Amino acid sequence: YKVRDISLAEWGRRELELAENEMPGLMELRREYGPSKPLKGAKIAGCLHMTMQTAVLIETLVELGAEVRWASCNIFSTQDHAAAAIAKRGIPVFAWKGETEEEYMWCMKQTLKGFGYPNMLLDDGGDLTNYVLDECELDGKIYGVSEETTTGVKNLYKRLQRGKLTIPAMNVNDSVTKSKFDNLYGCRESLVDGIKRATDVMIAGKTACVCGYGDVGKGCAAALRGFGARVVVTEVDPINALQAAMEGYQVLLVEDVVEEAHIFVTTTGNDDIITSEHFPRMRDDAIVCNIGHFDTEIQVAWLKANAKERVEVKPQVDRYTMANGRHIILLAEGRLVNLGCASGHPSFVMSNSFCNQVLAQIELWTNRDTGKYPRGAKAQVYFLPKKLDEKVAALHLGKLGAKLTKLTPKQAEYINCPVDGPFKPDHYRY
Amino acid sequence: YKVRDISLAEWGRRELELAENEMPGLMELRREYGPSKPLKGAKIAGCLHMTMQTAVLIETLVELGAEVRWASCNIFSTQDHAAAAIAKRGIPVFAWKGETEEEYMWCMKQTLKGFSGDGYPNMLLDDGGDLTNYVLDECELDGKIYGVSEETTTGVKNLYKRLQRGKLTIPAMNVNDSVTKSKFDNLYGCRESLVDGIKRATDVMIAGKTACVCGYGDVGKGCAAALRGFGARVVVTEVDPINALQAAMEGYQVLLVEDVVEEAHIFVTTTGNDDIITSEHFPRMRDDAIVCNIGHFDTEIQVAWLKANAKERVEVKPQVDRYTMANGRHIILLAEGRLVNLGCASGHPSFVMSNSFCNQVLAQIELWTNRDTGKYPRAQVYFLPKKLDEKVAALHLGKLGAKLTKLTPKQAEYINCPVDGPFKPDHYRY
Amino acid sequence: YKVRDISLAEWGRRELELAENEMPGLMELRREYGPSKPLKGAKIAGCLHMTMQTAVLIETLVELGAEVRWASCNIFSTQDHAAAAIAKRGIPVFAWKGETEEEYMWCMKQTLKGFSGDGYPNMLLDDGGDLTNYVLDECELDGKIYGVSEETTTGVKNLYKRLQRGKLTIPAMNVNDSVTKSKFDNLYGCRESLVDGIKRATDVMIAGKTACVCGYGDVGKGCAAALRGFGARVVVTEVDPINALQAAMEGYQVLLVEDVVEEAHIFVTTTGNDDIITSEHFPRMRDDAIVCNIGHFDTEIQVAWLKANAKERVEVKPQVDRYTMANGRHIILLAEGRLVNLGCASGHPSFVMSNSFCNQVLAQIELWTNRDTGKYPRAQVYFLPKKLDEKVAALHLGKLGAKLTKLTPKQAEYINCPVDGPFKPDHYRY
Amino acid sequence: YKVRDISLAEWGRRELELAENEMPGLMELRREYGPSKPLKGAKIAGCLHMTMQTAVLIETLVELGAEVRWASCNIFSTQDHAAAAIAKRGIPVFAWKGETEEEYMWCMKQTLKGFGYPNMLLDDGGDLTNYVLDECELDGKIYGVSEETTTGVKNLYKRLQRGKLTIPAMNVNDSVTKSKFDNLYGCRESLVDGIKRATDVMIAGKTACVCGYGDVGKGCAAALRGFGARVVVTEVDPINALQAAMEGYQVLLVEDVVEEAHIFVTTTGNDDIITSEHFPRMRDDAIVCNIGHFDTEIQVAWLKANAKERVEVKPQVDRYTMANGRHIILLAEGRLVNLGCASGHPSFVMSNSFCNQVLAQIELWTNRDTGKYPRGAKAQVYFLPKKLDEKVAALHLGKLGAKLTKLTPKQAEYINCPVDGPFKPDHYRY
Ligand SMILES: NC(=O)c1ccc[n+]([C@@H]2O[C@H](COP(=O)([O-])OP(=O)(O)OC[C@H]3O[C@@H](n4cnc5c(N)ncnc54)[C@H](O)[C@@H]3O)[C@@H](O)[C@H]2O)c1
Ligand SMILES: NC(=O)c1ccc[n+]([C@@H]2O[C@H](COP(=O)([O-])OP(=O)(O)OC[C@H]3O[C@@H](n4cnc5c(N)ncnc54)[C@H](O)[C@@H]3O)[C@@H](O)[C@H]2O)c1
Ligand SMILES: NC(=O)c1ccc[n+]([C@@H]2O[C@H](COP(=O)([O-])OP(=O)(O)OC[C@H]3O[C@@H](n4cnc5c(N)ncnc54)[C@H](O)[C@@H]3O)[C@@H](O)[C@H]2O)c1
Ligand SMILES: NC(=O)c1ccc[n+]([C@@H]2O[C@H](COP(=O)([O-])OP(=O)(O)OC[C@H]3O[C@@H](n4cnc5c(N)ncnc54)[C@H](O)[C@@H]3O)[C@@H](O)[C@H]2O)c1
Secondary structure, three states, X not given: OEOOOHHHHHHHHHHHHHHHHOOHHHHHHHHHHOOOOOOOOOEEEEEOOOOHHHHHHHHHHHHOXXXXXXXXXXXXXXXXXXXXXXXXXXXXXXXXXXXXXXXXXXXXXXXXOOOOOOOEEEEOXXXXXXXHHHOXXXXXXXXXXXXXXXXXXXXXXXXXXXXXXXXOEEEOOOOHHHHOOHHHHHHHHHHHHHHHHXXXXXXXXXXXXXXXXXXXXXXHHHHHHHOOOEEEEEOOOHHHHHHHHHOOOEEOOHHHHOOOOOEEEEOOOOXXXXXXXXXXXXXXXXXXXXXXXXXXXXXXXXXXXXOOEEEEEEOOEEEEEOOOOOEEEEEHHHOOHHHHOOOOOOXXXXXXXXXXXXXXXXXXXXXXXXOOOOOHHHOOEEOOOHHHHHHHHHHHHHHHOOOOOOOOHHHXXXXXXXXXXXXOOOOOOO | OEEOOHHHXXXXXXXXXXXXXXXXXXXXXXXXXXXXXXXXXXXXXXEOOOOHHHHHHHHHHHHOOXXXXXXXOOOOOOXXXXXXXXXXXXXXXXXXXXXXXXXXXXXXXXOOOOEXXXXXXXXXXXXOOHHHHHXXXXXXXXXXXXXXXXXXXXXXXXXXXXXXXXXXXXXXXXXXXXXXXXXXXXXXXXXXXXXXXXXXXXXXXXXXXXXXXXXXOHHHHHHHHHHHHOOXXXXXXXOOHHHHHHHHHOOOEEOOHHHHOOOOOEEEEOOOOOOOEXXXXXXXXXXXXXXXXXXXXXXXXOHHHHHHHOOEEEEEEOOEEEEEOOOOXXXXXXXXXXXXXXXXXXXXXXXXXXXXXXXXXXXXXXXXXXXXXXXXXXXXXXXXXXXXXXXXXXXXXHHHOOOOOOOOHHHHHHOOOOOOOOOOOOOOOO | OEEOOHHHHHHHHHHHHHHHHHOHHHHHHHHHHOOOOOOXXXXXXXXXXXXXXHHHHHHHHHHOOOEEEEEOXXXXXXXXXXXXXXXXXXXXXXXXXXXXXXXXXXXHHHOXXXXXXXXXXXXXXEOOOHHHHHHHHHOOOOOOOXXXXXXXXXXXXXXXXXXXHOOOOOOEEEOOOOHHHXXXXXXXXXXXXXXXXXXHHHOOOOOOOEEEEEOOOHHHHHHHHHHHHOOOEEEEEOOOHHHXXXXXHOOOEEOOHHHHOOOOOEEEEOOOOOOOEOXXXXXXXXXXXXXXXXXXXXXXXXXXXXXXXXXXXXXXXXXXXXXXXXXXXXXXXXXXXXXXXXXXXXXXXXXXHHHHHHHHHHHHHHHHHOOOOOOOOOOOEEEOOHHHHHHHXXXXXXXXXXXXXXXXXXXXXXXXXXXXXXXXXXXXXX | OEOOOHHHHHHHHHHHHHHHHOOHHHHHHHHHXXXXXXXXXXXXXXXXXXXXXXXXXXXXXXXXXXXXXXXOOOOOOOOXXXXXXXXXXXXXXXXXXOOOXXXXXXXXXXXXXXXOXXXXXXXXXXHHHHHHHHOOOXXXXXXXXXXXXXXHHHHHHHHHHHOOOOOOEEEOOOOHHHHOOHHHXXXXXXXXXXXXXXXXXXXXXXXXXXXXXXXXXXXXXXXXXXXXXXXXXXXXXXXXXXXXXXXXXXEOOHHHHOOOOOEEEEOOOOOOOEOOOOHHHXXXXXXXXEOOXXXXXXXXXXXXXXXXXXXXXXXXXXXXEXXXXXXXXXXXXXXXXXXXXXXXXXXXXXXXXXHHHHHHHHHHHHOOOOOOOOOHXXXXXXXXXXXXXXXXXXXXXXXXXXXXXXXXXXXXXXXXXXXXXXXXXXXXXX
């Protein structure tokens, strides 16, 4: 293994206890599936933010029988204490806060041997997937990949369309219990957290520009508005844009507010959102950040190349002075601000996300000599069955004291579903 | 025709001038498609709440070339000046506020005769499923219908029950489950039209009250939001753990009706299911508890039991009945359990109804124009194509002054869609 | 008496049974003070919107022993079934919906005669100041009035102008500035009754629209909140930097009417000032812009200019006038600039009006019982004592099921108040 | 001086730059009053949280001519970098994070000499005021004190009532621009910040108990609800309690929710809110914190004395194990959580607060041989004049782009104020 400081493992372990209590879903799967060991002999290479919450996931997969080796999926997201807690325990992990792109891909390469290869992939952003497929040989050897975020799943569909998807892929992001909770309610808390730990800026009164209005944009807009920001939103999709208008947000172009906005938040999963056209027009000390998976939503390379002064205010906060004499504050060098300047999403919402990930791995690994998840030419992307999506939500109601009504036989019949569900048809959007 | 009072045509013509300006989408289809007349030949049997909004829909269909005959799909939903205006214009309408069950039935049968030729309709446009049921189960139109478009969740639920049972003979387009309907009309429509119905009915203060919203689907989401916006403390009931986790995560107590039945001042039923508010709840309610339904059918509330077992019933005003129970305490029932927004107010505002009714126009066009293309065999349920979903939304941005960002080619390639969309994959939940 | 239609007494009696159950505070004063009759001798001249809520106020005063004569303080605010019920009960009322300016004037003069003795009133109860102005400037009652209680901000503003000018002769109790009035009625009342007036008037969608709220006092705060709750993008105008910073800090753009006059779909004037929406604004407005006022007098809007300079005026329905301007575009004016909540709807709900009208009962009791104690010389403006402010609030908690913590002696000593309060210093702003 | 680490001054200075930009009010007073030196020879002993924001205040008072010596007012609130930045500059400061009660009062004693005494007091919480008055001789020597928070001002009024107020006191907390901004909007951002930096807990879904519903409680409740918490509120005041009910919060007793609440937040400024009666009933890992000025709102001494295990999770987060085997997480040992576990209120809102503080010091110090602020027997508590309250708000509108409307002479006359204000009568509550 390799982590910043192994001494921090003790502190890491103390917080994993509190993290475990806040993740009743992951812990119940540990009770339920621990004994039967559904991932007996699984060899999972994981590429996903090395947080305290991922620490609980990792320890679940090992509890369910899996061998596992881990790397972060971002150079700033690793929490040095969670990594050290995993390392002290003996699960091979290669992650620390502040990796170079070279060290990053080094860490990811360490997880693809020494089990000896992996036979399963667990990924957040598609870097591992693309790498295993395009740079190794692991196309007779890997039985499935579980993909956690929208940009990675986009990646997966570009491969299916092209004819290059060689292994079955589970689309975890698009579980209702991931997509409409993690992406939405997670960012609604973890965006402002990163902004505030970085800059301690007052949100109340400010004009914020939120680019994109999908699940991430929805959450980020609701958070900023909640603290008294006036939020304006940009969009390319007429539907998402109209959702934003009907929720009371102005929908305009970045150019329309670039000179007046105090805060710029990128949420699209698309590159070149905030560019060389925008930077020189920004007000003094306009804070610029991104919460989408890749930093290239912001032209940071341009900012660095064209700024006249750069000051590290503190780690993951760079204050640039432009040729016009005004300042730009960039957060986490454009990397995911919630994970880079704070601790990401709280444990409780990641319990939903990671439950789907555990269920996904069980689905693909246990059914490996089944033909239910075909290899090679005919490999395709799948979702978790809706029954399992419901199971995950049901596992998280108790902690909150939410009480569920039970359908009578006549009611289930009238609605056209089973008494124990699934309750909605597969096209339902929640 | 058959309306209450034809001298209300003048007043309805005046409001339709305001309705037209609030429905840019429908008026923009009137301009785009009227010259070519794509529903020429079309003989539409219509069964949808006869409001001012539907009047702009009915005149769009006739501008597009269709012959049309209409009836309201609820006994108390007609706006009498709406029907009077359409009736003067020469369109056959059978609809008044306060139809008995007998009279309601007669009106529907009128819409299935009196076309040109041995003019039996060749098309259906449905809200709730009743017309579809009557035509397929009881009329003879066996060889004569090329499609049905279905407006609501309850009506669509029946279509899927029929298809499942091998009894769907005519192709059906699911309009409710267009994104620009379900995530707009069901949600934002109810967010404004629910409290409108309650207040016009009772003038009651929302702020400070305890309100039990039963169900937390698209309609339940909207109602809870509306009540909470006015300072109600809203508690939610759900059978679905996913919807329940959403409500919990938005700040609402999720409990059983029985947990709040003694303290709630307001009960709203939004389920699309029967026997939510029953004989076991009614005698437990606090004095002057307001009970209403905004689901399609009234049998979410056991109103027959209420009527059978009340000691006293008083009409405060039409559609507001105050019952005295055996216990001496009172229950205020709205619209006899009928959709309260349409029953005690005017239904959703025009602007949102423009989203829904655009979908209905493009669905009728899609079904009818492919009536000799063999694309919808006379039998499945279909969705409007996402391209047309987006179009609907795009037509409504201008009125609000919302501006849409345009993707570059690099950007569209990177996110895997055309520069002009569809922008999202078919399973996206918005 | 003089009402529109006395056969509406029956319908009004039925609604007053619901109003009574929604006004626990007024009904609790009826029980507490009725036995002792503390307003015995009292001859109250009343000038306050003749609604169902005021009917419960008028019957409380008469239960308390007072003789009372009433007139509405606005031409379109009367609820005709409210007046019909009070008129049947034997109380002299002069009030109908749609009084001319002549007729309005006659009704007020009726309330100043016909008491017992050479029965000139000995008390005034005012909303807006007009009765106070008429009695003091133009009637003879010079030796005969022991007090006036003033309901609203505009009326109270006049009382302070008079006191300043050395023209206040009768003691005045400022009821508007009780906390349980100003921070409740003005705020929460308008939060529900504004959109009620707009929607009953126009059925217009709020969601998605741009609304200009002019003024951000207690009424402005409520209106903006209401519009925003439904997905309006609200912009605010203010002359006061403190109120402006509040609106900015709550997420609202603070700008000049001229900055949004061309794009706003909805203008609300809440200032208590004249010439907010003027001849310079009207010709600039978008087609079918909705203009209304919820301030006391209509002259916040230059309606005379509008009427003088419109090419066309059309009555969509009573109190909804659609003007065609020289430019060909339309303006929708509500209630001819009169208070839109009372003009196009029913005013604030009963429950909040119970807070305000309790204050009015305890103010009349305070003034009248000290009518031979020399406490209010016949001349200053006064406030209800904070003890009675708190009492009003305390009377309304039960209905909502709110529970109040009780201070220990140690705790009351530590925060420097009695165990039973007053709990706050006289300058506390809540 | 004495601070943790003088080396941190550099980092401290970099952030004071960003803090200055975010405090346009303080910086404008520095421009306006810098030249004339209104505090020429002032000798200000300051007892107020030694944050980055206080650093900007301190440097303003020195810019305006004052000598100044500083101590924190809480043992956990000092930001070691801001203190070091002040110390490097040469302003005597005695503060570090993690002072003992002995070291704390040592630091406060250092500020009352070496100018040689002070002649002015600047205080947050009343510890300095009480000390200077009850333990020194500085009753011929001190010309005025400026008091920043509600509990200190309470203290001041207990002294006035008793007859022990010997020097004029400026009540800064009760400036509208302090009370209704700092207390309200400040806590609305800085509460969740402290909770999240401490525990990274998910707010969405949780039941939070907020004790008190004054300005602090209002903000804290709005913040928690904003992230999807279900917030219940406790109160002793019927008015504040009814405000909470009408905003949609349950109002109940701590005993009513003690077993189910995930988070307990104390906001009263009263002791013994969360006690030995509550601790043993709390759910596993219930988070307990206080945001009021003194930690004695929570019985921490009891918790420590009766818990079976205590673990420092990390600095300012103690996890206690109770005799029942369940856990309590206590934040900042019960001290102000926003300052103790985070960075307090953002700079922009503290600019309002500290502008009143600068204006206050100028008012008392410049008018020292005036008799406007009488010494000894007849000393009384004063507010800032309303003109100056408005000035402070006006200084903060620009940064936000808020545009103020200018009254015409007729409008100012009609409203009964000057064109340049003050705009409201002194009883106005905003
Ligand atoms: N930071 C985190 O902890 C975390 C969590 C979840 C998701 N994500 C990431 O966030 C990103 C977005 O995820 P999502 O679920 O919201 O995706 P999404 O598809 O739901 O939303 C993205 C939105 O951006 C819009 N868009 C595309 N190009 C645009 C342009 N140039 N300008 C304005 N809008 C544009 C799309 O139309 C879409 O609605 C992805 O990169 C995903 O991997 C990060
Ligand atoms: N009044 C209107 O103008 C209007 C508008 C749109 C839709 N509708 C109607 O409203 C109803 C709801 O529509 P929707 O789109 O929200 O449907 P939906 O399926 O999304 O929501 C209904 C919800 O009720 C829940 N439910 C079912 N039985 C329950 C029970 N016994 N107790 C608690 N919850 C239960 C389901 O889990 C579901 O989430 C339908 O009947 C639809 O036709 C009315
Ligand atoms: N319709 C109702 O049922 C109802 C209820 C209560 C009060 N009112 C009336 O509503 C009005 C407002 O009451 P309030 O309690 O909010 O008064 P308020 O003094 O608190 O608020 C009025 C606000 O308007 C601002 N203002 C003044 N002139 C302005 C201008 N030209 N442009 C922009 N802003 C300007 C002021 O600064 C002030 O903050 C009064 O006339 C009052 O009598 C009506
Ligand atoms: N942490 C910070 O950065 C900061 C900022 C501002 C104020 N404060 C402090 O916060 C505290 C409150 O300030 P505020 O301005 O809200 O005061 P406030 O008087 O407006 O509010 C306190 C409320 O608590 C209520 N109360 C008293 N005893 C109670 C009891 N035992 N149970 C429930 N409620 C009770 C009162 O009725 C009152 O409404 C003070 O100690 C003040 O110094 C701290």
